[PDB]
Amino acid sequence: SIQAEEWYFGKITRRESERLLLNAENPRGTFLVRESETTKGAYCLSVSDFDNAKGLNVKHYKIRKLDSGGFYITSRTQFNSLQQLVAYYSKHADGLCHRLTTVCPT
Ligand SMILES: CC(=O)N[C@@H](Cc1ccc(P(=O)(O)O)c(P(=O)(O)O)c1)C(=O)N[C@H]1CCCCN(Cc2ccc(-c3ccccc3)cc2)C1=O
């Protein structure tokens, strides 16, 4: 279950996810997963970043879930669960702004 996951923030807006992630103490890759504001059944992976050009900023990645069963950001790379997806992206940056590091503070 995802609702039991400490990184699952459920139904919070994009503005609120940014409010939480834009904390100067959050290092690159701080993250949270929330419901997709407009795609039913889909999720959103909001991640903090930091670079000299943009300074502290947030990126949001849409996570889709098929009825076939897999979860994915890109259809090319699928997982059986949201937890598995999160674990994979905590080890690989791939197309993300940074690998997932730790759960965003409240
Ligand atoms: C308006 C906004 O914030 N849109 C987001 C997507 C988003 C998606 C859904 C929802 P919700 O409605 O449905 O929730 C919200 P929101 O409004 O709630 O905030 C916000 C976005 O466009 N992010 C970018 C993030 C990285 C840059 C590229 N990109 C396309 C892309 C390119 C490469 C990869 C990639 C990643 C990993 C591996 C390989 C490639 C992924 C995406 C994005 O989508």
PDB file of all heavy atoms in Angstrom, residues 12-15 17-18 34-40 42-46 58-64 73-74 77 89 92-97, ligand 1:
ATOM      1  N   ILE A  12      -2.701  16.703  -2.396  1.00  0.00           N
ATOM      2  CA  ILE A  12      -2.235  18.044  -2.052  1.00  0.00           C
ATOM      3  C   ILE A  12      -1.970  18.654  -3.427  1.00  0.00           C
ATOM      4  O   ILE A  12      -1.735  17.929  -4.392  1.00  0.00           O
ATOM      5  CB  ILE A  12      -0.978  18.071  -1.127  1.00  0.00           C
ATOM      6  CG1 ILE A  12       0.241  17.408  -1.783  1.00  0.00           C
ATOM      7  CG2 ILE A  12      -1.282  17.357   0.161  1.00  0.00           C
ATOM      8  CD1 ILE A  12       1.519  17.737  -1.078  1.00  0.00           C
ATOM      9  N   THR A  13      -2.102  19.959  -3.541  1.00  0.00           N
ATOM     10  CA  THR A  13      -1.935  20.643  -4.806  1.00  0.00           C
ATOM     11  C   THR A  13      -0.471  20.796  -5.225  1.00  0.00           C
ATOM     12  O   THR A  13       0.467  20.581  -4.459  1.00  0.00           O
ATOM     13  CB  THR A  13      -2.580  22.067  -4.722  1.00  0.00           C
ATOM     14  OG1 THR A  13      -1.869  22.851  -3.754  1.00  0.00           O
ATOM     15  CG2 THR A  13      -4.026  21.988  -4.292  1.00  0.00           C
ATOM     16  N   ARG A  14      -0.282  21.248  -6.451  1.00  0.00           N
ATOM     17  CA  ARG A  14       1.039  21.497  -6.985  1.00  0.00           C
ATOM     18  C   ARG A  14       1.668  22.664  -6.217  1.00  0.00           C
ATOM     19  O   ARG A  14       2.852  22.635  -5.968  1.00  0.00           O
ATOM     20  CB  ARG A  14       0.931  21.856  -8.476  1.00  0.00           C
ATOM     21  CG  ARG A  14       2.249  22.057  -9.181  1.00  0.00           C
ATOM     22  CD  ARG A  14       2.016  22.175 -10.710  1.00  0.00           C
ATOM     23  NE  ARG A  14       3.257  22.501 -11.427  1.00  0.00           N
ATOM     24  CZ  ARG A  14       3.852  23.710 -11.425  1.00  0.00           C
ATOM     25  NH1 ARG A  14       3.310  24.720 -10.741  1.00  0.00           N
ATOM     26  NH2 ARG A  14       5.011  23.920 -12.081  1.00  0.00           N
ATOM     27  N   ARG A  15       0.866  23.676  -5.869  1.00  0.00           N
ATOM     28  CA  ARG A  15       1.352  24.837  -5.129  1.00  0.00           C
ATOM     29  C   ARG A  15       1.814  24.439  -3.744  1.00  0.00           C
ATOM     30  O   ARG A  15       2.800  24.976  -3.266  1.00  0.00           O
ATOM     31  CB  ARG A  15       0.269  25.905  -4.988  1.00  0.00           C
ATOM     32  CG  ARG A  15       0.723  27.121  -4.180  1.00  0.00           C
ATOM     33  CD  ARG A  15      -0.354  28.269  -4.167  1.00  0.00           C
ATOM     34  NE  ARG A  15       0.034  29.414  -3.343  1.00  0.00           N
ATOM     35  CZ  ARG A  15       0.831  30.405  -3.752  1.00  0.00           C
ATOM     36  NH1 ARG A  15       1.333  30.401  -4.986  1.00  0.00           N
ATOM     37  NH2 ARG A  15       1.121  31.415  -2.930  1.00  0.00           N
ATOM     38  N   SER A  17       2.762  21.318  -2.831  1.00  0.00           N
ATOM     39  CA  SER A  17       3.932  20.470  -2.949  1.00  0.00           C
ATOM     40  C   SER A  17       5.138  21.367  -3.105  1.00  0.00           C
ATOM     41  O   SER A  17       6.188  21.053  -2.518  1.00  0.00           O
ATOM     42  CB  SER A  17       3.802  19.486  -4.118  1.00  0.00           C
ATOM     43  OG  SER A  17       3.912  20.146  -5.379  1.00  0.00           O
ATOM     44  N   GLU A  18       5.010  22.475  -3.845  1.00  0.00           N
ATOM     45  CA  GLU A  18       6.132  23.395  -4.020  1.00  0.00           C
ATOM     46  C   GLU A  18       6.405  24.143  -2.730  1.00  0.00           C
ATOM     47  O   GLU A  18       7.559  24.446  -2.431  1.00  0.00           O
ATOM     48  CB  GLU A  18       5.910  24.396  -5.167  1.00  0.00           C
ATOM     49  CG  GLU A  18       5.881  23.697  -6.476  1.00  0.00           C
ATOM     50  CD  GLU A  18       5.704  24.577  -7.673  1.00  0.00           C
ATOM     51  OE1 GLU A  18       5.599  25.806  -7.550  1.00  0.00           O
ATOM     52  OE2 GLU A  18       5.668  24.023  -8.781  1.00  0.00           O
ATOM     53  N   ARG A  34       2.192  12.533  -4.863  1.00  0.00           N
ATOM     54  CA  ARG A  34       0.843  13.022  -4.581  1.00  0.00           C
ATOM     55  C   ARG A  34      -0.092  12.614  -5.696  1.00  0.00           C
ATOM     56  O   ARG A  34       0.369  12.066  -6.688  1.00  0.00           O
ATOM     57  CB  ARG A  34       0.871  14.540  -4.491  1.00  0.00           C
ATOM     58  CG  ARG A  34       1.502  15.158  -5.664  1.00  0.00           C
ATOM     59  CD  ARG A  34       1.577  16.650  -5.490  1.00  0.00           C
ATOM     60  NE  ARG A  34       2.229  17.295  -6.614  1.00  0.00           N
ATOM     61  CZ  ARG A  34       1.581  17.890  -7.614  1.00  0.00           C
ATOM     62  NH1 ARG A  34       0.250  17.968  -7.604  1.00  0.00           N
ATOM     63  NH2 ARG A  34       2.275  18.435  -8.602  1.00  0.00           N
ATOM     64  N   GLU A  35      -1.393  12.832  -5.533  1.00  0.00           N
ATOM     65  CA  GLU A  35      -2.318  12.496  -6.607  1.00  0.00           C
ATOM     66  C   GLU A  35      -2.067  13.481  -7.758  1.00  0.00           C
ATOM     67  O   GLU A  35      -1.621  14.618  -7.606  1.00  0.00           O
ATOM     68  CB  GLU A  35      -3.787  12.687  -6.200  1.00  0.00           C
ATOM     69  CG  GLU A  35      -4.345  11.733  -5.207  1.00  0.00           C
ATOM     70  CD  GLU A  35      -5.820  11.997  -4.965  1.00  0.00           C
ATOM     71  OE1 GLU A  35      -6.396  12.900  -5.614  1.00  0.00           O
ATOM     72  OE2 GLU A  35      -6.408  11.306  -4.112  1.00  0.00           O
ATOM     73  N   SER A  36      -2.383  12.991  -8.948  1.00  0.00           N
ATOM     74  CA  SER A  36      -2.322  13.755 -10.185  1.00  0.00           C
ATOM     75  C   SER A  36      -3.525  14.728 -10.127  1.00  0.00           C
ATOM     76  O   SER A  36      -4.657  14.280  -9.974  1.00  0.00           O
ATOM     77  CB  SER A  36      -2.502  12.773 -11.345  1.00  0.00           C
ATOM     78  OG  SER A  36      -3.030  13.391 -12.508  1.00  0.00           O
ATOM     79  N   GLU A  37      -3.290  16.032 -10.163  1.00  0.00           N
ATOM     80  CA  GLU A  37      -4.380  17.002 -10.110  1.00  0.00           C
ATOM     81  C   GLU A  37      -5.441  16.810 -11.208  1.00  0.00           C
ATOM     82  O   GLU A  37      -6.604  17.230 -11.035  1.00  0.00           O
ATOM     83  CB  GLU A  37      -3.842  18.419 -10.232  1.00  0.00           C
ATOM     84  CG  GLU A  37      -3.225  19.050  -9.009  1.00  0.00           C
ATOM     85  CD  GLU A  37      -2.988  20.531  -9.241  1.00  0.00           C
ATOM     86  OE1 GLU A  37      -2.989  20.924 -10.422  1.00  0.00           O
ATOM     87  OE2 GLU A  37      -2.830  21.326  -8.286  1.00  0.00           O
ATOM     88  N   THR A  38      -5.087  16.214 -12.342  1.00  0.00           N
ATOM     89  CA  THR A  38      -6.095  16.072 -13.378  1.00  0.00           C
ATOM     90  C   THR A  38      -6.211  14.724 -14.050  1.00  0.00           C
ATOM     91  O   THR A  38      -7.206  14.410 -14.712  1.00  0.00           O
ATOM     92  CB  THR A  38      -5.995  17.201 -14.412  1.00  0.00           C
ATOM     93  OG1 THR A  38      -4.676  17.258 -14.911  1.00  0.00           O
ATOM     94  CG2 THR A  38      -6.369  18.568 -13.772  1.00  0.00           C
ATOM     95  N   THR A  39      -5.228  13.872 -13.856  1.00  0.00           N
ATOM     96  CA  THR A  39      -5.372  12.573 -14.465  1.00  0.00           C
ATOM     97  C   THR A  39      -5.791  11.561 -13.423  1.00  0.00           C
ATOM     98  O   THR A  39      -5.055  11.237 -12.500  1.00  0.00           O
ATOM     99  CB  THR A  39      -4.099  12.164 -15.198  1.00  0.00           C
ATOM    100  OG1 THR A  39      -3.664  13.251 -16.025  1.00  0.00           O
ATOM    101  CG2 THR A  39      -4.374  10.940 -16.055  1.00  0.00           C
ATOM    102  N   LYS A  40      -7.033  11.108 -13.528  1.00  0.00           N
ATOM    103  CA  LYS A  40      -7.584  10.127 -12.588  1.00  0.00           C
ATOM    104  C   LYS A  40      -6.718   8.863 -12.578  1.00  0.00           C
ATOM    105  O   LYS A  40      -6.157   8.450 -13.607  1.00  0.00           O
ATOM    106  CB  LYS A  40      -9.053   9.799 -12.917  1.00  0.00           C
ATOM    107  CG  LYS A  40      -9.459  10.061 -14.412  1.00  0.00           C
ATOM    108  CD  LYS A  40     -10.121   8.823 -15.058  1.00  0.00           C
ATOM    109  CE  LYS A  40      -9.127   7.630 -15.183  1.00  0.00           C
ATOM    110  NZ  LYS A  40      -9.776   6.296 -14.940  1.00  0.00           N
ATOM    111  N   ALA A  42      -3.805   8.498 -11.906  1.00  0.00           N
ATOM    112  CA  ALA A  42      -2.373   8.833 -12.070  1.00  0.00           C
ATOM    113  C   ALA A  42      -1.796   9.559 -10.851  1.00  0.00           C
ATOM    114  O   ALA A  42      -2.543  10.102 -10.044  1.00  0.00           O
ATOM    115  CB  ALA A  42      -2.154   9.665 -13.310  1.00  0.00           C
ATOM    116  N   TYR A  43      -0.473   9.583 -10.732  1.00  0.00           N
ATOM    117  CA  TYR A  43       0.174  10.233  -9.605  1.00  0.00           C
ATOM    118  C   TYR A  43       1.154  11.270 -10.090  1.00  0.00           C
ATOM    119  O   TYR A  43       1.367  11.442 -11.294  1.00  0.00           O
ATOM    120  CB  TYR A  43       0.911   9.210  -8.732  1.00  0.00           C
ATOM    121  CG  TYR A  43       0.012   8.150  -8.159  1.00  0.00           C
ATOM    122  CD1 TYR A  43      -0.217   6.961  -8.842  1.00  0.00           C
ATOM    123  CD2 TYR A  43      -0.637   8.352  -6.951  1.00  0.00           C
ATOM    124  CE1 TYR A  43      -1.082   5.991  -8.341  1.00  0.00           C
ATOM    125  CE2 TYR A  43      -1.505   7.402  -6.440  1.00  0.00           C
ATOM    126  CZ  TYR A  43      -1.731   6.217  -7.143  1.00  0.00           C
ATOM    127  OH  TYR A  43      -2.643   5.299  -6.658  1.00  0.00           O
ATOM    128  N   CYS A  44       1.718  12.004  -9.144  1.00  0.00           N
ATOM    129  CA  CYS A  44       2.693  12.996  -9.457  1.00  0.00           C
ATOM    130  C   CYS A  44       3.869  12.853  -8.514  1.00  0.00           C
ATOM    131  O   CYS A  44       3.673  12.653  -7.320  1.00  0.00           O
ATOM    132  CB  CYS A  44       2.082  14.388  -9.357  1.00  0.00           C
ATOM    133  SG  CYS A  44       3.236  15.524  -9.925  1.00  0.00           S
ATOM    134  N   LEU A  45       5.075  12.820  -9.071  1.00  0.00           N
ATOM    135  CA  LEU A  45       6.309  12.740  -8.301  1.00  0.00           C
ATOM    136  C   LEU A  45       6.922  14.131  -8.321  1.00  0.00           C
ATOM    137  O   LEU A  45       7.426  14.601  -9.349  1.00  0.00           O
ATOM    138  CB  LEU A  45       7.292  11.731  -8.921  1.00  0.00           C
ATOM    139  CG  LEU A  45       8.739  11.765  -8.400  1.00  0.00           C
ATOM    140  CD1 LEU A  45       8.814  11.380  -6.890  1.00  0.00           C
ATOM    141  CD2 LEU A  45       9.606  10.833  -9.260  1.00  0.00           C
ATOM    142  N   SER A  46       6.858  14.812  -7.180  1.00  0.00           N
ATOM    143  CA  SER A  46       7.396  16.159  -7.084  1.00  0.00           C
ATOM    144  C   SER A  46       8.747  16.041  -6.375  1.00  0.00           C
ATOM    145  O   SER A  46       8.900  15.476  -5.290  1.00  0.00           O
ATOM    146  CB  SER A  46       6.391  17.074  -6.361  1.00  0.00           C
ATOM    147  OG  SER A  46       5.109  16.976  -6.977  1.00  0.00           O
ATOM    148  N   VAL A  58      11.570  23.169  -8.156  1.00  0.00           N
ATOM    149  CA  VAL A  58      10.846  21.897  -8.106  1.00  0.00           C
ATOM    150  C   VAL A  58      10.430  21.428  -9.502  1.00  0.00           C
ATOM    151  O   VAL A  58      10.013  22.247 -10.335  1.00  0.00           O
ATOM    152  CB  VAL A  58       9.536  22.046  -7.282  1.00  0.00           C
ATOM    153  CG1 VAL A  58       8.785  20.689  -7.115  1.00  0.00           C
ATOM    154  CG2 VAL A  58       9.847  22.665  -5.966  1.00  0.00           C
ATOM    155  N   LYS A  59      10.497  20.117  -9.717  1.00  0.00           N
ATOM    156  CA  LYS A  59      10.078  19.479 -10.973  1.00  0.00           C
ATOM    157  C   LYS A  59       8.984  18.468 -10.627  1.00  0.00           C
ATOM    158  O   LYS A  59       8.990  17.879  -9.543  1.00  0.00           O
ATOM    159  CB  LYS A  59      11.262  18.822 -11.657  1.00  0.00           C
ATOM    160  CG  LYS A  59      12.268  19.788 -12.248  1.00  0.00           C
ATOM    161  CD  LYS A  59      11.674  20.475 -13.526  1.00  0.00           C
ATOM    162  CE  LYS A  59      12.796  21.373 -14.234  1.00  0.00           C
ATOM    163  NZ  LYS A  59      12.561  21.732 -15.685  1.00  0.00           N
ATOM    164  N   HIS A  60       8.004  18.297 -11.511  1.00  0.00           N
ATOM    165  CA  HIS A  60       6.914  17.391 -11.257  1.00  0.00           C
ATOM    166  C   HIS A  60       6.843  16.393 -12.380  1.00  0.00           C
ATOM    167  O   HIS A  60       6.847  16.802 -13.517  1.00  0.00           O
ATOM    168  CB  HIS A  60       5.579  18.149 -11.187  1.00  0.00           C
ATOM    169  CG  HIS A  60       5.611  19.290 -10.211  1.00  0.00           C
ATOM    170  ND1 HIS A  60       5.224  19.160  -8.901  1.00  0.00           N
ATOM    171  CD2 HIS A  60       5.975  20.588 -10.368  1.00  0.00           C
ATOM    172  CE1 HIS A  60       5.322  20.332  -8.301  1.00  0.00           C
ATOM    173  NE2 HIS A  60       5.777  21.216  -9.168  1.00  0.00           N
ATOM    174  N   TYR A  61       6.821  15.119 -12.046  1.00  0.00           N
ATOM    175  CA  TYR A  61       6.784  14.028 -13.010  1.00  0.00           C
ATOM    176  C   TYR A  61       5.510  13.236 -12.855  1.00  0.00           C
ATOM    177  O   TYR A  61       5.181  12.692 -11.799  1.00  0.00           O
ATOM    178  CB  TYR A  61       7.998  13.095 -12.827  1.00  0.00           C
ATOM    179  CG  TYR A  61       9.304  13.832 -12.914  1.00  0.00           C
ATOM    180  CD1 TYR A  61       9.926  14.304 -11.750  1.00  0.00           C
ATOM    181  CD2 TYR A  61       9.888  14.150 -14.155  1.00  0.00           C
ATOM    182  CE1 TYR A  61      11.064  15.062 -11.805  1.00  0.00           C
ATOM    183  CE2 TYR A  61      11.040  14.909 -14.210  1.00  0.00           C
ATOM    184  CZ  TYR A  61      11.615  15.359 -13.012  1.00  0.00           C
ATOM    185  OH  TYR A  61      12.737  16.119 -13.007  1.00  0.00           O
ATOM    186  N   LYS A  62       4.790  13.120 -13.965  1.00  0.00           N
ATOM    187  CA  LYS A  62       3.553  12.398 -13.974  1.00  0.00           C
ATOM    188  C   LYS A  62       3.816  10.903 -13.985  1.00  0.00           C
ATOM    189  O   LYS A  62       4.642  10.444 -14.782  1.00  0.00           O
ATOM    190  CB  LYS A  62       2.706  12.801 -15.199  1.00  0.00           C
ATOM    191  CG  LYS A  62       1.389  12.165 -15.172  1.00  0.00           C
ATOM    192  CD  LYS A  62       0.416  12.687 -16.203  1.00  0.00           C
ATOM    193  CE  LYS A  62       0.064  14.128 -15.949  1.00  0.00           C
ATOM    194  NZ  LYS A  62      -1.373  14.547 -16.344  1.00  0.00           N
ATOM    195  N   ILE A  63       3.200  10.161 -13.065  1.00  0.00           N
ATOM    196  CA  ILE A  63       3.382   8.722 -13.019  1.00  0.00           C
ATOM    197  C   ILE A  63       2.082   8.085 -13.477  1.00  0.00           C
ATOM    198  O   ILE A  63       1.015   8.296 -12.892  1.00  0.00           O
ATOM    199  CB  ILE A  63       3.674   8.189 -11.591  1.00  0.00           C
ATOM    200  CG1 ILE A  63       5.044   8.689 -11.075  1.00  0.00           C
ATOM    201  CG2 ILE A  63       3.530   6.656 -11.586  1.00  0.00           C
ATOM    202  CD1 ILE A  63       5.291   8.430  -9.528  1.00  0.00           C
ATOM    203  N   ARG A  64       2.150   7.304 -14.538  1.00  0.00           N
ATOM    204  CA  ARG A  64       0.963   6.642 -14.997  1.00  0.00           C
ATOM    205  C   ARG A  64       0.888   5.201 -14.529  1.00  0.00           C
ATOM    206  O   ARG A  64       1.883   4.570 -14.181  1.00  0.00           O
ATOM    207  CB  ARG A  64       0.819   6.787 -16.509  1.00  0.00           C
ATOM    208  CG  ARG A  64      -0.127   7.934 -16.837  1.00  0.00           C
ATOM    209  CD  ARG A  64       0.166   8.513 -18.096  1.00  0.00           C
ATOM    210  NE  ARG A  64       1.248   9.461 -17.934  1.00  0.00           N
ATOM    211  CZ  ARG A  64       1.558  10.359 -18.855  1.00  0.00           C
ATOM    212  NH1 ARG A  64       0.863  10.393 -19.984  1.00  0.00           N
ATOM    213  NH2 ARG A  64       2.483  11.270 -18.611  1.00  0.00           N
ATOM    214  N   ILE A  73       6.935   6.434 -15.424  1.00  0.00           N
ATOM    215  CA  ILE A  73       7.038   7.843 -15.790  1.00  0.00           C
ATOM    216  C   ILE A  73       7.163   7.762 -17.323  1.00  0.00           C
ATOM    217  O   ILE A  73       6.432   8.454 -18.042  1.00  0.00           O
ATOM    218  CB  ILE A  73       8.212   8.533 -15.152  1.00  0.00           C
ATOM    219  CG1 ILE A  73       7.904   8.754 -13.660  1.00  0.00           C
ATOM    220  CG2 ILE A  73       8.448   9.909 -15.833  1.00  0.00           C
ATOM    221  CD1 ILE A  73       9.099   9.268 -12.917  1.00  0.00           C
ATOM    222  N   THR A  74       8.060   6.908 -17.820  1.00  0.00           N
ATOM    223  CA  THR A  74       8.149   6.677 -19.268  1.00  0.00           C
ATOM    224  C   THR A  74       7.720   5.241 -19.516  1.00  0.00           C
ATOM    225  O   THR A  74       8.191   4.335 -18.850  1.00  0.00           O
ATOM    226  CB  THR A  74       9.538   6.925 -19.880  1.00  0.00           C
ATOM    227  OG1 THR A  74       9.488   6.567 -21.277  1.00  0.00           O
ATOM    228  CG2 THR A  74      10.666   6.143 -19.141  1.00  0.00           C
ATOM    229  N   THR A  77      10.054   2.165 -19.206  1.00  0.00           N
ATOM    230  CA  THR A  77      10.556   1.681 -17.913  1.00  0.00           C
ATOM    231  C   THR A  77       9.402   1.500 -16.913  1.00  0.00           C
ATOM    232  O   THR A  77       9.001   2.451 -16.240  1.00  0.00           O
ATOM    233  CB  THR A  77      11.590   2.725 -17.418  1.00  0.00           C
ATOM    234  OG1 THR A  77      12.521   2.937 -18.476  1.00  0.00           O
ATOM    235  CG2 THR A  77      12.358   2.283 -16.194  1.00  0.00           C
ATOM    236  N   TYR A  89      14.073   4.901  -8.888  1.00  0.00           N
ATOM    237  CA  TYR A  89      14.534   6.268  -9.099  1.00  0.00           C
ATOM    238  C   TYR A  89      15.392   6.851  -7.962  1.00  0.00           C
ATOM    239  O   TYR A  89      15.996   7.903  -8.122  1.00  0.00           O
ATOM    240  CB  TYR A  89      13.374   7.163  -9.558  1.00  0.00           C
ATOM    241  CG  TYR A  89      12.966   6.845 -10.998  1.00  0.00           C
ATOM    242  CD1 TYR A  89      11.745   6.239 -11.280  1.00  0.00           C
ATOM    243  CD2 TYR A  89      13.849   7.092 -12.070  1.00  0.00           C
ATOM    244  CE1 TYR A  89      11.397   5.866 -12.567  1.00  0.00           C
ATOM    245  CE2 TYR A  89      13.501   6.732 -13.397  1.00  0.00           C
ATOM    246  CZ  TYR A  89      12.268   6.112 -13.623  1.00  0.00           C
ATOM    247  OH  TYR A  89      11.862   5.726 -14.883  1.00  0.00           O
ATOM    248  N   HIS A  92      18.728   5.666  -9.712  1.00  0.00           N
ATOM    249  CA  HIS A  92      19.015   6.145 -11.081  1.00  0.00           C
ATOM    250  C   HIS A  92      18.429   7.523 -11.357  1.00  0.00           C
ATOM    251  O   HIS A  92      17.233   7.671 -11.155  1.00  0.00           O
ATOM    252  CB  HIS A  92      18.389   5.186 -12.113  1.00  0.00           C
ATOM    253  CG  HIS A  92      18.749   3.755 -11.889  1.00  0.00           C
ATOM    254  ND1 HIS A  92      19.824   3.168 -12.513  1.00  0.00           N
ATOM    255  CD2 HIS A  92      18.230   2.828 -11.056  1.00  0.00           C
ATOM    256  CE1 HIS A  92      19.955   1.931 -12.065  1.00  0.00           C
ATOM    257  NE2 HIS A  92      19.004   1.701 -11.184  1.00  0.00           N
ATOM    258  N   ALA A  93      19.220   8.477 -11.825  1.00  0.00           N
ATOM    259  CA  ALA A  93      18.674   9.779 -12.134  1.00  0.00           C
ATOM    260  C   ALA A  93      17.884   9.643 -13.455  1.00  0.00           C
ATOM    261  O   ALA A  93      16.745  10.109 -13.530  1.00  0.00           O
ATOM    262  CB  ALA A  93      19.798  10.813 -12.274  1.00  0.00           C
ATOM    263  N   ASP A  94      18.450   8.953 -14.453  1.00  0.00           N
ATOM    264  CA  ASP A  94      17.795   8.807 -15.765  1.00  0.00           C
ATOM    265  C   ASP A  94      17.324  10.171 -16.305  1.00  0.00           C
ATOM    266  O   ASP A  94      18.178  11.043 -16.496  1.00  0.00           O
ATOM    267  CB  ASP A  94      16.642   7.786 -15.707  1.00  0.00           C
ATOM    268  CG  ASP A  94      17.137   6.336 -15.598  1.00  0.00           C
ATOM    269  OD1 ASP A  94      18.386   6.119 -15.513  1.00  0.00           O
ATOM    270  OD2 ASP A  94      16.267   5.418 -15.596  1.00  0.00           O
ATOM    271  N   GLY A  95      16.023  10.361 -16.534  1.00  0.00           N
ATOM    272  CA  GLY A  95      15.504  11.637 -17.044  1.00  0.00           C
ATOM    273  C   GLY A  95      15.041  12.594 -15.958  1.00  0.00           C
ATOM    274  O   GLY A  95      14.565  13.691 -16.257  1.00  0.00           O
ATOM    275  N   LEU A  96      15.215  12.211 -14.682  1.00  0.00           N
ATOM    276  CA  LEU A  96      14.822  13.081 -13.549  1.00  0.00           C
ATOM    277  C   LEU A  96      15.858  14.193 -13.287  1.00  0.00           C
ATOM    278  O   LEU A  96      17.044  14.148 -13.679  1.00  0.00           O
ATOM    279  CB  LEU A  96      14.639  12.234 -12.262  1.00  0.00           C
ATOM    280  CG  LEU A  96      13.638  11.091 -12.188  1.00  0.00           C
ATOM    281  CD1 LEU A  96      13.617  10.571 -10.751  1.00  0.00           C
ATOM    282  CD2 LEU A  96      12.232  11.567 -12.580  1.00  0.00           C
ATOM    283  N   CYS A  97      15.424  15.240 -12.589  1.00  0.00           N
ATOM    284  CA  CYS A  97      16.334  16.322 -12.244  1.00  0.00           C
ATOM    285  C   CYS A  97      17.430  15.863 -11.265  1.00  0.00           C
ATOM    286  O   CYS A  97      18.484  16.515 -11.228  1.00  0.00           O
ATOM    287  CB  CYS A  97      15.567  17.522 -11.661  1.00  0.00           C
ATOM    288  SG  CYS A  97      14.625  17.178 -10.124  1.00  0.00           S
TER     289      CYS A  97
HETATM  290  C1  LIG B   1       2.890  21.892 -15.371  1.00  0.00           C
HETATM  291  C2  LIG B   1       3.909  20.999 -14.766  1.00  0.00           C
HETATM  292  O1  LIG B   1       4.534  21.239 -13.726  1.00  0.00           O
HETATM  293  N1  LIG B   1       4.017  19.909 -15.530  1.00  0.00           N
HETATM  294  C3  LIG B   1       4.914  18.790 -15.236  1.00  0.00           C
HETATM  295  C4  LIG B   1       4.190  17.439 -15.268  1.00  0.00           C
HETATM  296  C5  LIG B   1       3.087  17.501 -14.232  1.00  0.00           C
HETATM  297  C6  LIG B   1       2.421  16.343 -14.543  1.00  0.00           C
HETATM  298  C7  LIG B   1       1.197  16.039 -14.031  1.00  0.00           C
HETATM  299  C8  LIG B   1       0.657  16.914 -13.156  1.00  0.00           C
HETATM  300  P1  LIG B   1      -0.893  16.391 -12.518  1.00  0.00           P
HETATM  301  O2  LIG B   1      -1.943  17.473 -12.855  1.00  0.00           O
HETATM  302  O3  LIG B   1      -1.722  15.311 -13.326  1.00  0.00           O
HETATM  303  O4  LIG B   1      -0.765  15.918 -11.151  1.00  0.00           O
HETATM  304  C9  LIG B   1       1.281  18.070 -12.738  1.00  0.00           C
HETATM  305  P2  LIG B   1       0.241  18.956 -11.661  1.00  0.00           P
HETATM  306  O5  LIG B   1      -0.544  19.960 -12.356  1.00  0.00           O
HETATM  307  O6  LIG B   1      -0.501  18.211 -10.630  1.00  0.00           O
HETATM  308  O7  LIG B   1       1.316  19.497 -10.911  1.00  0.00           O
HETATM  309  C10 LIG B   1       2.567  18.462 -13.252  1.00  0.00           C
HETATM  310  C11 LIG B   1       6.092  18.724 -16.196  1.00  0.00           C
HETATM  311  O8  LIG B   1       5.901  19.109 -17.384  1.00  0.00           O
HETATM  312  N2  LIG B   1       7.283  18.314 -15.712  1.00  0.00           N
HETATM  313  C12 LIG B   1       8.433  18.126 -16.602  1.00  0.00           C
HETATM  314  C13 LIG B   1       9.573  17.705 -15.661  1.00  0.00           C
HETATM  315  C14 LIG B   1      10.992  17.439 -16.321  1.00  0.00           C
HETATM  316  C15 LIG B   1      11.172  18.128 -17.654  1.00  0.00           C
HETATM  317  C16 LIG B   1      10.526  17.332 -18.786  1.00  0.00           C
HETATM  318  N3  LIG B   1       9.112  16.850 -18.684  1.00  0.00           N
HETATM  319  C17 LIG B   1       8.871  15.879 -19.779  1.00  0.00           C
HETATM  320  C18 LIG B   1       9.667  14.656 -19.508  1.00  0.00           C
HETATM  321  C19 LIG B   1      10.899  14.375 -20.166  1.00  0.00           C
HETATM  322  C20 LIG B   1      11.692  13.288 -19.712  1.00  0.00           C
HETATM  323  C21 LIG B   1      11.245  12.513 -18.602  1.00  0.00           C
HETATM  324  C22 LIG B   1      12.026  11.370 -18.063  1.00  0.00           C
HETATM  325  C23 LIG B   1      12.017  11.052 -16.670  1.00  0.00           C
HETATM  326  C24 LIG B   1      12.589   9.854 -16.197  1.00  0.00           C
HETATM  327  C25 LIG B   1      13.172   8.962 -17.118  1.00  0.00           C
HETATM  328  C26 LIG B   1      13.272   9.292 -18.482  1.00  0.00           C
HETATM  329  C27 LIG B   1      12.701  10.503 -18.958  1.00  0.00           C
HETATM  330  C28 LIG B   1       9.985  12.777 -18.002  1.00  0.00           C
HETATM  331  C29 LIG B   1       9.183  13.842 -18.467  1.00  0.00           C
HETATM  332  C30 LIG B   1       8.136  17.085 -17.698  1.00  0.00           C
HETATM  333  O9  LIG B   1       7.043  16.505 -17.688  1.00  0.00           O
END
